[PDB]
Write a protein that binds this DNA or RNA. Structure first.
Lengths: 76, 92, 334, 89, 96, 108, 105, 93, 84, 99
DNA sequence: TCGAGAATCCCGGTGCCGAGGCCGCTCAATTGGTCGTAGACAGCTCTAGCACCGCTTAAACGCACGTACGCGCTGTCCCCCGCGTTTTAACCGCCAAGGGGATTACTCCCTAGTCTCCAGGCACGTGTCAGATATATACATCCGA
DNA sequence: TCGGATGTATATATCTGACACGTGCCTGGAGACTAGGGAGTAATCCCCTTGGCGGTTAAAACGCGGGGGACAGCGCGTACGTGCGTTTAAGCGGTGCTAGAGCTGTCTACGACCAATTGAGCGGCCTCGGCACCGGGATTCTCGA
């Protein structure tokens, strides 16, 4: 179970995801990949905003689902 | 100075096709397509904002306009693209 | 028989308002309870949703198909749990009937209950006979025609929406348009000996002894058990040009199989492909083919194995695989 | 959870455009003789035209955040396709 | 006993349904067909009493306008009866 | 006194100019108050349509063993796609010709 | 001194209402003073022509009340009106009475 | 609140072109939709003519040219004459 | 400055034959070369009238390549490749 | 010895050679003279942009080809193979140009 | 079922010109505030959309029958196509001239905006007569003989 | 050409519901004044259109032979029009329920607007290679036995 986080530059990354975890841990995992701060990550999938607090299975993110990641304009 | 979407249509081609060019006449057609489709959607949203007595062209009006003009699955794909884009825009 | 504009028969409207005397009246007269309306809800579904028990008891005792699929492939367990009936799901589990069922979304009934009691109670270990020939001879077609006109039947233009019986001259089923439309619709496939049996007795015979025990038989049992078609929630895209089987012939195959022809090549990294959220009923129970049901079909002539058959939720399967699917009435892995 | 509501839908109602109705539309068109295979073709063409017009009439309604397809957003759905309709606006 | 030769009543109905303006399709079956078609596009959509009328007043006026062209094609092939190929050709020429 | 000037096109990930689309939506008197997300949505729709047409034209050009896209390739790409042909049904792509097809009855 | 603009030009259609609809329709940033008096005169002529033809059709039909059928006859009987109103569908309008020469015995 | 239409004006035109002939209600709605449709055609073409010349106003010329473009043949020849006569009677008075 | 006349014959019979071959026509009747010229004159008049009145509204005397595209757009025949 | 193609095979190779090409099928100078003589009754002494007559021609060739693609289906509808002056009129009446 | 000849396509080599790139420049996109108002949202009211039931009744439907003609086959001819030879003007190159398209500067008159005043048309009734509805009568038309 | 059944047009009673007319009012249209800029007008540059002359050859024109298709005629079956009995939902009235259309009030977040800034796009030029063009050897149609 892995996803594809596509940054606005077009470069995508692969990272292990638990099928029943929440967004907080997988958002903090991006810090171990590119050093992105969790407070200002704002990942997007299927046109939704995917705010923290809810699990990933709520948005029905299956395997190899390409997500997005826009950063607030203060550090982009 | 005349304006054209040539700089952009080349960028979109380098995305859809890394090794592919476009002749002057094809850029002139693709620019006319982007201007014609832009005019179609803008006029639809204009007629769509006047039907509801509105005065603001919102993302919803453009979404309905591209749902009206574009046929078949093309509209369902363009709506998703516009949605993905505006979500990344307003989230920054 | 008599039906409503919504496909609701007499038993449907009798079980919706839960009128039990009418239910007994229509069940003791011989009405078939394993019937789906224009949506696909059976009397079991309606009864379970509205909260009625005696009608469910009579239906279970009158040999009604309990493992049925409703509008969005909703099993009766789904509605019975979605509407909070505990004794109802208890009575349903008293007969079993695939407690681990699945809707089009993929949500097993447990994902509906939102109730502790149900979550703890669930997890414990015919009409006109149309006879038309498929690739037969001249005198064979005349024989089928006279057998149809003596047995009160008709002769259609190689297919219609009311075809129930097809015939094969050989022992194995071919791969032409008509046999695919027969298998996907769940018709009876005969080895041309059934007409030979009827011409000796001048009456109808049993189709069980003259049916081939292969994929078509699985499709027949699928149609009889009211389960959905083969290619349900499977979206198919025809890439390039086809010469063996026309693109139009494949389109008709996908339409008859219940699948949607995608008009635009499904990009594996787009948002539309990943927002599908549908499963396939005939996908292998717990393999990597249920959550990813979207196929790009192509004739295996030049483009060989691209070393990647699945990229997310988009599959690249050859047309020979699509034909072998109808051969076996399954979704073979890749 | 779920909608907890059976969605009762209609099906095969294209047969409501019966054979005599198609004959009277033809007779009005000026047709003298009518082949038997054209009734299915006629009702299919009618279903296609309605799906092309109602789809625009529905999205004209979904935009206004309504749930009743009015008569003014149907003539608007017909004006877009060139089939302007006088009498309802 | 007394039987209008095949075609006499046909012309008698052509002269009748052309001078009249009443709707030739039954209203309730067309309303049910509209509700059956619109259910694919949005669930629980309601229709005004004038919406279905406006949706049929221009629907049969399109079918009548199609059958004029189907006649003009059946006559082009030196025929009297119209066939599915006539409607197919009319739609292909008209851009449908 | 001012942070980095990140253009709106790169903020939405799309390639077409959000600023130019916004300027043209305002200066074409389509309405009085053009929204902020409407130019982004319209630029995204235009970019998707352009990407589809260009992908089909490149696929048509690779079949002709050519890299540079010509109006003939655009005509072969639009007229071969059902949806794109419905969109451009009343459009003449200059120097595009027609689709190569002969009626099965005309052939011997 | 309340001489309306529709009475100055000698028209019967509203000049002020046409001006208001040109200003509200968002057709241009500015609207000339001679545009409403010109547009309200073309609409007053087109109406005075379609109604003239409809009244002629009603007189030839032994009636004194213009109905949608008479409007359809007036629109489809004139060559210029049939080209202008060629794509419109007049509700309750019917069809021009005509039969092909091949169908007549 | 309420709708606006050219019903009274169509009545006043009919009273001078056919003093003995009246009009129905469904036929009045059709005339109201017809006037509202030719308006959106001439004004819709006026927007385009103004933009094509980078103009910001809609003068009498940008309405005469739209009548000439949309109206077919003789109707256009007479419509521009009526419009010019109305403009002349309006500017002089 | 020059007065021109009878220039529709300039659309020669082999030109119409080439147009029909491109359209897919295999056999052409001898009377097509006179009806096609009439249809061509009708269409060219319909487009050129709109182009010329566009030019007259623009207060010009040179029919540009843009008002012709506009005239083709008015008739539902938008022409791509000449917008600039 | 005098190899003479059968009637009907040169037309097929002429269709195959003109459907894959994009060049203008009518000579430029006669079409230009036709356009200039048509635009003589509307406004006399009128100039034409070099890209205007080409745009007129680029649209006119496509129009006459789409008409010849529609009038050929009428010829096949009548169980024929040649197009007659009676089917162009039909294709133009169905399309809405002579009704 | 075979033999000579034409057209299509692939590979290799040459060369004019247009596509991609670079640089100077500028004006339009971006950002930052600031203020006005458009519409999102909550709330209330009313009506028309939906649903049902009862009764009648005219149209939809199935079936039997006759025949109109759609289609297939045959024969005739004629005219359109393929080809060779004569013709001719489209096209390319070059040169010249000037009419008007584009631009800029100046100005002024026309139209948006605002305040005020007023009466014309729309909602609401309300009286009334013209086309339908039925009844009776006469003329032209189709079918059979 | 004549006789009988019937569709169609025409004259008359009554009749009813939609059309023509009267009235309150309020909100949109008209007057008057002011301010700003969009467009009319004059002058200027050049460039892009028009016109002409000379040579070439490839498309156009014309004559001719032939065969393939357009068209007329005839036969056959079959499928569609037509009439009759049956049925089956369409349609109209009557009532009931309420979901949602429509209007009203708050307010707040979003978009117009102005000032300062800068960098991305646009025009000018600059170069080189994908593509057009030509020649040679090896696959497909096509005529013609």
């Amino acid at each position: 179970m892995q996803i594809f986080v596509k940054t606005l530059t077009g470069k995508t990354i692969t990272l292990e995801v638990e099928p029943s975890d929440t967004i907080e841990n997988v958002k903090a995992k991006i810090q171990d990949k590119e050093g992105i701060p969790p407070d200002q990550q704002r990942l997007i999938f299927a046109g939704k905003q995917l705010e923290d607090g809810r699990t990933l299975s709520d948005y029905n993110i299956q395997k190899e689902s390409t997500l997005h990641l826009v950063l607030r304009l203060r550090g982009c | 100075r005349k304006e054209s979407y040539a700089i952009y249509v080349y960028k979109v081609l380098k995305q859809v096709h890394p090794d592919t060019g476009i002749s002057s006449k094809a850029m002139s057609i693709m620019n006319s397509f982007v201007n014609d489709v832009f005019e179609r959607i803008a006029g639809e949203a204009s007629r769509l904002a006047h039907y509801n007595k509105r005065s603001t062209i919102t993302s919803r009006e453009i979404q309905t306009a591209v749902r009206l003009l574009l046929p078949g699955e093309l509209a369902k794909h363009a709506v998703s693209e516009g949605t993905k884009a505006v979500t990344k825009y307003t989230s920054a | 028989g008599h039906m409503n504009h919504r496909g609701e028969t007499l038993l449907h409207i009798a079980s919706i308002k839960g009128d039990i005397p009418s239910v007994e009246y229509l069940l003791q007269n011989g009405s078939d309870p394993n019937v789906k309306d224009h949506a696909g809800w059976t009397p079991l579904h309606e009864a379970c949703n509205h909260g009625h028990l005696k009608v469910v008891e009579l239906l279970l005792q009158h040999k009604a198909l309990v493992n049925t699929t409703g509008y969005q492939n909703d099993s009766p367990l789904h509605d019975a749990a979605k509407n909070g009936h505990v004794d109802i799901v208890k009575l349903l589990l008293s007969y079993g009937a695939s407690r681990n069922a699945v809707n089009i979304f993929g949500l097993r009934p447990v994902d509906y209950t939102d109730d502790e009691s149900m979550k703890s109670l669930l997890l414990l270990p015919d009409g006109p006979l149309v006879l038309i020939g498929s690739g037969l001879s001249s005198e064979q077609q005349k024989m089928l025609s006279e057998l149809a006109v003596i047995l009160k039947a008709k002769k259609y233009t190689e297919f219609d929406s009311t075809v129930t019986h097809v015939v094969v001259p050989g022992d194995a089923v071919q791969s032409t348009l008509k046999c695919m439309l027969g298998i996907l619709n769940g018709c009876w496939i005969l080895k041309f000996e059934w007409v030979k049996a009827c011409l000796r007795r001048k009456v109808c015979e049993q189709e069980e002894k003259y049916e081939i025990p292969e994929g078509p038989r699985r499709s027949r049992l699928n149609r009889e058990q009211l389960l959905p078609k083969l290619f349900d929630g499977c979206y198919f895209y025809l890439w390039g040009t086809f010469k063996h089987h026309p693109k139009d012939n494949l389109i008709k195959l996908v339409t008859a199989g219940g699948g949607q022809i995608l008009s635009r090549k499904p990009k594996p990294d787009s948002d539309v492909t990943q927002t599908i959220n549908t499963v396939a009923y005939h996908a292998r129970p717990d393999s990597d083919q249920r959550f990813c049901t979207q196929y790009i079909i192509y004739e295996d002539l030049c483009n060989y194995h691209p070393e990647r058959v699945r990229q997310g939720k988009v599959w690249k399967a050859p047309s020979s695989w699509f034909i072998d699917c109808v051969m076996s009435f399954e979704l073979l892995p890749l | 959870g779920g909608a907890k509501r059976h969605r009762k839908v209609l099906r095969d109602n294209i047969q409501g455009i019966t054979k005599p109705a198609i004959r009277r539309l033809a007779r009005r068109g000026g047709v003298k003789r009518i082949s038997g295979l054209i009734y299915e073709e006629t009702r299919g063409v009618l279903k296609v035209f309605l799906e092309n017009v109602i789809r625009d009439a529905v999205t004209y309604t979904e935009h206004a955040k309504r749930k009743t397809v009015t008569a003014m957003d149907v003539v608007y759905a017909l004006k877009r396709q060139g089939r302007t309709l006088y009498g309802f606006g | 006993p007394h039987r209008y030769r095949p075609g006499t009543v046909a012309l008698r109905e052509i002269r009748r349904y052309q001078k009249s303006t009443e709707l030739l399709i039954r209203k309730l079956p067309f309303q049910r067909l509209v509700r059956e078609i619109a259910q694919d596009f949005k669930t629980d959509l309601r229709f005004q009493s004038s919406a279905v009328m406006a949706l049929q007043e221009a629907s049969e006026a399109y079918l009548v306008a199609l059958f004029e062209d189907t006649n003009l094609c059946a006559i082009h092939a030196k025929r009297v009866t119209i066939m599915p190929k006539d409607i197919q050709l009319a739609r292909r020429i008209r851009g449908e | 006194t001012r942070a980095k000037a990140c253009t709106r096109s790169s903020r939405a990930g799309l390639q077409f100019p959000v600023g130019r689309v916004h300027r043209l939506l305002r200066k074409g008197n389509y309405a009085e108050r053009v929204g902020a997300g409407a130019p982004v949505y319209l630029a995204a729709v235009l970019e998707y349509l352009t990407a589809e047409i260009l992908e089909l034209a490149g696929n048509a050009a690779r079949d002709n063993k050519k890299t540079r896209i010509i109006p003939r390739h655009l005509q072969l790409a639009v007229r071969n796609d059902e949806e794109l042909n419905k969109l451009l049904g009343r459009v003449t792509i200059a120097q595009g010709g027609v689709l190569p097809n002969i009626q099965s009855v005309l052939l011997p």
